[PDB]
Amino acid sequence: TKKRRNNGRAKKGRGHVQPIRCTNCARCVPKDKAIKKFVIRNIVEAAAVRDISEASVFDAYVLPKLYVKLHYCVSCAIHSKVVRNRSREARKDRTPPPRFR
Amino acid sequence: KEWLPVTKLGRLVKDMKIKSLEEIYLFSLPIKESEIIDFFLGASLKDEVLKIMPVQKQTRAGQRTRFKAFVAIGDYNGHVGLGVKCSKEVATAIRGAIILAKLSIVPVRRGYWGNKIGKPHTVPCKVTGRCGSVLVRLIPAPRGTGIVSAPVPKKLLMMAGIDDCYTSARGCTATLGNFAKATFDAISKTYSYLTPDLWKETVFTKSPYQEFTDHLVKTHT
Amino acid sequence: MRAKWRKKRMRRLKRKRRKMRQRSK
């Protein structure tokens, strides 16, 4: 039978949306269906940041970040442990998971 | 074989100040002790079973069967009930089904066909009761017709005391439990249908709990 | 068997039948 109120997407009064390409594989996926993520990453982690900070021309120099936006289909997101399955009752929750740290 | 009631209603019936349970249906109180109806309805109340069906559940090892028995209870000049209970052994299943039937009996009213002479014989109106997929219709019949039905709602209708019904059914009536439940729902809703015979405002008698709460507080703590 | 490939094989047999019917009028 029908699993969800929508169909794993957000297309309601459109009928057609443009497709995009996935990032892990090259599978063609519609834009509104793909599990997208936008991570704010760093150039260096918390190990080399002291090495850059002590051995720099300028003191207290702010390091640039890495803004990349990833687009995943269902199989690539599940197989790379991005989204996980839930219960039937626990599926009805559009809130993101909490960020304690 | 003494009676030790735990509710207010059972003790107050045991004190021999309830003349009939018609006022208990009038106040729509839950009949919670099964031996109150056994105290009221005695030799006029007899029973017969309907069907015992197999119900099985799988486990790691083998099949766990459990017997579910359908029985009905009711005097032939009024009230009628139905009860379902499922257990391992057959005798305790039948005993629990008879008990759960005696918890839930309802009174029915009987009407006329054309002329109002003597005692009534048939259902007053086309009263309909539906549960699951089964749809049961009870249409009044002229005097001396007899119950025309499938055999088990026919026996339920004579055990309810109604002499004449014109009946009809649709859907899968082979499930005898759901069919009997639909017949019980049809004969239960013969009270909740407003007719012009009763439109005046009923006088409000005092509550039996309100009438004998002094007796209750002088008997128990 | 899904319906697509059995529709395809009926299509090829229909084509072969039409060719043989045209060559055997």
């Binding site: - | 735990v6 509710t7 207010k8 729509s28 109180l29 309100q210 709460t213 507080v217 | -």
Partner: protein
């Protein structure tokens, strides 16, 4: 309920309503309680009427005094903000108190030791105590509620428009309800100030208990 020229508020009940902060309601509203609210003011707070609260106080007091057995009124609070108010109300009226952890088998399970079947039921809120209303639906039990402008009205009979977030307004309304019931019973006179203090009903957190113990004797 307010039809006589004796049973109204004289001068001081409105003063205690304004002192306890009973006049302000929640941000949200109920369409069942749109006639119990005066209007809406700025900052999204509803100003609540006091005559309507008085008329439900009369009606709740009448329904309580109407029966002649004081042990068949049951008063229930699950939140900590009114546990002592229920206890003092049952001490002053003879009622049956339930404070905290209402077990789900009191009104319907006949084999338990705590099998109760009262005649009237008063509860502090329909929001948090959505459990005793459904169990009091299965047996013919009425329901009296000290309900807020945001709390839903389901399975209730008298809905007193109240302020059930602060301890102050709730303790004052249990005190005035006990006062009015004891006036209808006749043990307490209708005109003499019988006030022991209304501070016998007021609840506070244990940090303020320690603070007041160290500040006072």
């Amino acid at each position: 309920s307010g039809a006589l020229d004796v049973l109204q508020m004289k001068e001081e009940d409105v003063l205690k309503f304004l002192a306890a902060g009973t006049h302000l309601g929640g941000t949200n509203l109920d369409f069942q309680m749109e006639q119990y609210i005066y209007k809406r003011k700025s900052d999204g707070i509803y100003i609540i009427n006091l005559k309507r609260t008085w008329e439900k106080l009369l009606l709740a007091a009448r329904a309580i005094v109407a029966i002649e057995n004081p042990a068949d009124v049951s008063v229930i609070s699950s939140r900590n903000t009114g546990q002592r108010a229920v206890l003092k109300f049952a001490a002053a009226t003879g009622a049956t108190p339930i404070a905290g952890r209402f077990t789900p088998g009191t009104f319907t399970n006949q084999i338990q030791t705590a099998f109760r079947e009262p005649r009237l039921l008063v509860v502090t809120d329909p929001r948090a105590d959505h459990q005793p209303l459904t169990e009091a639906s299965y047996v013919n039990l009425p329901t009296i509620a000290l309900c807020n402008t945001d709390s839903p009205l389901r399975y209730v009979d008298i809905a007193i428009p109240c302020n059930n977030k602060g301890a102050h307004s709730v303790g004052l309304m249990w005190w005035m309800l006990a006062r009015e019931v004891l006036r209808m019973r006749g043990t307490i006179s209708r005109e003499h100030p019988w006030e022991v203090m209304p501070d016998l009903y007021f609840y506070r957190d244990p940090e303020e208990i320690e603070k007041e113990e160290q500040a006072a004797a």
